[PDB]
Write a protein that binds this DNA or RNA. Structure first.
Ligand SMILES: [K+]
Ligand SMILES: [K+]
Ligand SMILES: [K+]
Ligand SMILES: [K+]
Ligand SMILES: [K+]
Ligand SMILES: [K+]
Ligand SMILES: [K+]
Ligand SMILES: [Mg+2]
Ligand SMILES: [Mg+2]
Ligand SMILES: [Mg+2]
Ligand SMILES: [Mg+2]
Ligand SMILES: [Mg+2]
Ligand SMILES: [Mg+2]
Ligand SMILES: [Mg+2]
Ligand SMILES: [Mg+2]
Ligand SMILES: [Mg+2]
Ligand SMILES: [Mg+2]
Ligand SMILES: [Mg+2]
Ligand SMILES: [Mg+2]
Ligand SMILES: [Mg+2]
Ligand SMILES: [Mg+2]
Ligand SMILES: [Mg+2]
Ligand SMILES: [Mg+2]
Ligand SMILES: [Mg+2]
Ligand SMILES: [Mg+2]
Ligand SMILES: [Mg+2]
Ligand SMILES: [Mg+2]
Ligand SMILES: [Mg+2]
Ligand SMILES: [Mg+2]
Ligand SMILES: [Mg+2]
Ligand SMILES: [Mg+2]
Ligand SMILES: [Mg+2]
Ligand SMILES: [Zn+2]
Lengths: 49, 53, 101, 111, 118, 147
RNA sequence: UAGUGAACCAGUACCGUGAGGGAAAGGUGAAAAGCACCCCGGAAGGGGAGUGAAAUAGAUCCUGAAACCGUGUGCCUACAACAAGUCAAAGCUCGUUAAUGAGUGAUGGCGUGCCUUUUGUAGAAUGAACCGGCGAGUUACGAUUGCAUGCGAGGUUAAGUC
RNA sequence: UAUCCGGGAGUCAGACUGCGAGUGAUAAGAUCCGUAGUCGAAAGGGAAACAGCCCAGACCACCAGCUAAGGUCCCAAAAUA
RNA sequence: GGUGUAGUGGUAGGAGAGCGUUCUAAGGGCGUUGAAGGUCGAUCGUGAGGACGGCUGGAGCGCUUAGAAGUGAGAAUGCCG
């Protein structure tokens, strides 16, 4: 392989999904957390079980 | 009471329409011909009604 | 003389020596095209197609193929944090009318 | 070669109040403008008069133009740097004060 | 690896402002007001690209009605008669004939009246 | 193709019509007159341009009011001062100021915009059988079939 | 506006009785060659004349955006009720990435902003004076699932040495 | 199309209309259920304006045509049928 | 690639595919015969967005492939100017 023609195997790497970066992305504003509630807070959610 | 809405440039300019200066009463002086205010002593030659003062 | 012909789901008035814009025709530029659905012929006399004037045809030459000015469809609903922007350029064919029969 | 300009920059005066006097003299013969400015009591009249006389001196000395023909072709006042000050108010607070400055430009042409 | 704001923000806002050119005062000068008005303009434009067809059909119908009345017939009677007579000339062409080619429109009206009588 | 005809101001000729209101219902007279004033009777009609014809109404004093409208149809108007409501019956308007009666009726049927008001100005109502617009060479407009 | 609070006389100025809190502020030009001399002005500041490749690089000095202010004018506007636009459009003006062009626009149709939060908001509910900059799902170690690669009843090294 | 297995959620304030009941006074744009629809998350046409009613589900271009609810004397398209 | 059929409103939210920003590596380039940046234009693409020309500007910067993120603002009575 040539350093100027590198190519990963198909499906080996994916693009990270960034939330809170506009509405059209599908995770804008609420960042997929919903509206209000405990699970919508930073550090929110109840302990496992 | 406070301005509920800011005044736009157009409305501001409209209001200032009449906020202008005026210059009136200027005409030539008999003695020296320079411009002077009517009924006032010509400041340059100090003459009024054809006499020095 | 002039004619009225059916083309692209629409009716257009045509005179010899005039260019008309119609929906994209599957014809190369500079080629002859014949509109065989003439719904009227007017001028000194009047021929009324019922629905089409029998044996009447209009001839033209495809001057150009082009795209109209872009149209932007921007759909959004207020207060629903949602919008969708879309572009369009409708293809068209410019045809010079040569003969009316 | 036909026009001369003079400018007074960062002159302490209200741009709006200066623009009033500038509107008086705009588009007038130099002699008429001088008379108007001399008999105008507003503060900016004298400053604008100095700028106008400077422009006329430029037209004459620097370019050898005909004084009698000169007319005020252009004249305007632009905002300059604003000095910030503060005025104490009631109840231990302060309010800003904008001490304004003006760029006064006068351009005089042969005809 | 720090990515400062750069020029992308200015480019985006300038595009919006150029779209807003010609608007009244702040609506073309200020980005936020400009964007809101441009969004409303998009909404109005999409709606009007459909209303425009309605309006022109309405205008053609009115003009055809006037011409039909002058020929001794109502718009509804004329359209029914043309349908019976197999005439497919649409309202755009009919209104064009009424204004421009009165003789041609009269011939169409005569055929429609004949079909109605039959 | 964008070839629809659009009228221009001043190119289209506006004729002058005389309408006889004798024993014609007020509303029907107003409706036909309003269509004429707007220009809906001419193929060159253009909604954004004035293209209608002038109308002169004669014998306005003899307009017809069916039912008890002569005594029961009441025209109101407010001075915009408190308790400043004034009223006048349609019959009284016909007797004293018939021009106002016809003009009010036709105003209601014209569009409420600049073009509508300009079109309204082309109206001229006269109680009695004579008008001062002979110079304009108006022609009679039979409306018996139009009402 | 980052990076130490501090690229610069910063733990300074400033604030507090005191402990303490705590800023703003970088860039002329290759070289000062930092505008001799003349003119207006009391000066400031300008106009010439010069230096310079460049002075609209003149020390508020590289670039010089937007808000904001002003000048000039191609078009429109003093019978009009306007979320300010959009669709249709005469007239006038102009000639572009030459495109079924551009600017303006009488007049007519339609039409109650954006965001948040709500069963429901043009909302007389919330937030934004405007512009610019900064400003919010990241990393470490583990768990689990998908996808991918190597090997395969095997797979794999950790600390550590070079 | 249904199951099943697994990854990722959001939702636990609903509203009105029609129909069947309760509570209420056989009142409430009331309240509480069952049931169907719409809104919620749905633009468009009609009901003057009018989320929930009637008709109907916008991928786009057209200065083409036929219709639904609703309408055809003028505003205002279409019957002074 | 072609034909046919069907489908393409959408909040919470799930899936997929992309635009743009800074930087790294490789390759291939561009720049005092004017880079970045700024500004204007009637340009191209389905979208984020991409070119091209004029003017300003005066020294760095694209392009292709892959990689890493302080990677995208219009709202927080946000902070500073
Ligand atoms: K989620
Ligand atoms: K410079
Ligand atoms: K201007
Ligand atoms: K309008
Ligand atoms: K409140
Ligand atoms: K129910
Ligand atoms: K803010
Ligand atoms: Mg990664
Ligand atoms: Mg979503
Ligand atoms: Mg948002
Ligand atoms: Mg929230
Ligand atoms: Mg909740
Ligand atoms: Mg929740
Ligand atoms: Mg005190
Ligand atoms: Mg930013
Ligand atoms: Mg339709
Ligand atoms: Mg420069
Ligand atoms: Mg500078
Ligand atoms: Mg009036
Ligand atoms: Mg007027
Ligand atoms: Mg509530
Ligand atoms: Mg507020
Ligand atoms: Mg209830
Ligand atoms: Mg909700
Ligand atoms: Mg609806
Ligand atoms: Mg709503
Ligand atoms: Mg659909
Ligand atoms: Mg039909
Ligand atoms: Mg009608
Ligand atoms: Mg860079
Ligand atoms: Mg960031
Ligand atoms: Mg801000
Ligand atoms: Zn004197």
């Amino acid at each position: 392989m040539k350093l100027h023609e590198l190519k990963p195997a198909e499906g080996s790497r994916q693009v990270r999904n960034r939330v809170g970066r506009g509405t059209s992305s599908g995770n804008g504003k609420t960042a997929g957390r919903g509206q209000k509630g405990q699970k919508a807070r930073s550090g929110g959610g109840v302990r496992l079980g | 009471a406070v301005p509920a809405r800011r005044t736009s440039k157009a409305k501001k300019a409209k209001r200032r329409t009449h906020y202008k200066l005026t210059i009136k009463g200027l005409n030539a002086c008999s003695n020296c011909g320079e411009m002077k205010k009517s009924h006032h002593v010509c400041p340059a030659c100090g003459h009024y009604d054809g006499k020095d003062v | 003389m002039y004619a009225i012909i059916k083309t692209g789901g629409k009716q257009v008035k045509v005179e010899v020596g005039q260019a008309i814009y119609v929906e994209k025709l599957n014809v190369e530029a500079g080629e002859k095209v014949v509109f065989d659905e003439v719904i009227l012929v007017g001028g000194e006399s009047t021929k009324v197609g019922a629905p089409t004037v029998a044996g009447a045809t209009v001839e033209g030459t495809v001057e150009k193929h082009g795209k109209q000015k872009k149209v932007v469809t921007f759909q959004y609903k207020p207060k629903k944090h949602s919008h969708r922007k879309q572009g369009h350029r409708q293809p068209y064919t410019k045809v010079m009318i040569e003969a009316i029969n | 070669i036909t026009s001369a300009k003079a400018t007074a920059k960062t002159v302490r005066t209200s741009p709006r109040k200066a623009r009033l006097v500038i509107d008086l003299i705009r588009g007038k013969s130099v002699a008429d403008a001088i008379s108007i400015l001399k008999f105008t009591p507003n503060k900016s009249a004298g400053i604008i008069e100095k700028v106008l006389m400077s422009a006329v001196a430029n037209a004459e000395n620097n370019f050898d133009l005909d004084v009698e023909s000169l007319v005020v072709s252009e004249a305007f006042v632009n905002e300059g740097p604003t000095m910030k000050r503060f005025r104490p108010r009631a109840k231990g607070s302060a309010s800003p004060i904008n001490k304004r400055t003006s760029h006064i430009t006068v351009v005089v042409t042969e005809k | 690896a720090r990515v400062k704001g750069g020029t992308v923000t200015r480019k985006r806002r300038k595009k919006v402002l150029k779209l807003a050119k010609g608007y009244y005062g702040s609506k073309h000068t200020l980005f936020k007001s400009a964007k809101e008005q441009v969004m409303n303009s998009y909404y109005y434009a999409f709606r009007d690209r459909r209303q425009k067809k309605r309006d022109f059909r309405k205008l053609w119908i009115a003009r055809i009605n006037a011409a039909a009345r002058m020929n001794g017939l109502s718009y509804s009677k004329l359209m029914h008669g043309l349908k019976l007579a197999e005439i497919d000339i649409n309202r755009k062409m009919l209104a064009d004939l009424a204004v421009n080619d009165a003789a041609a429109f009269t011939a169409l009206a005569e055929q429609a009246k004949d079909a109605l009588s039959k | 193709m964008r070839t629809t005809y659009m009228a221009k101001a001043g190119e289209v000729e506006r004729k002058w019509y005389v309408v006889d209101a004798t024993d014609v219902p007020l509303g029907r007279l107003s409706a036909v007159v309003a269509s004429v004033l707007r220009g809906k009777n001419k193929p060159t009609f253009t909604p954004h341009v004035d293209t209608g014809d002038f109308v002169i109404v004669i014998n306005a004093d003899k307009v017809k009011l069916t039912g008890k409208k002569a005594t029961d149809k009441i025209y109101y108007r407010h001075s915009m001062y408190p308790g400043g409501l004034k009223s006048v019956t349609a019959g009284e308007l016909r007797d004293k100021n018939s021009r106002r009666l016809i003009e009010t009726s036709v105003k209601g049927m014209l569009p409420k915009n600049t073009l509508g008001r300009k079109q309204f100005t082309k109206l001229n109502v006269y109680g009695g059988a004579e008008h001062p617009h002979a110079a304009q060479q108006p022609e009679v407009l039979d409306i018996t079939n139009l009402i």
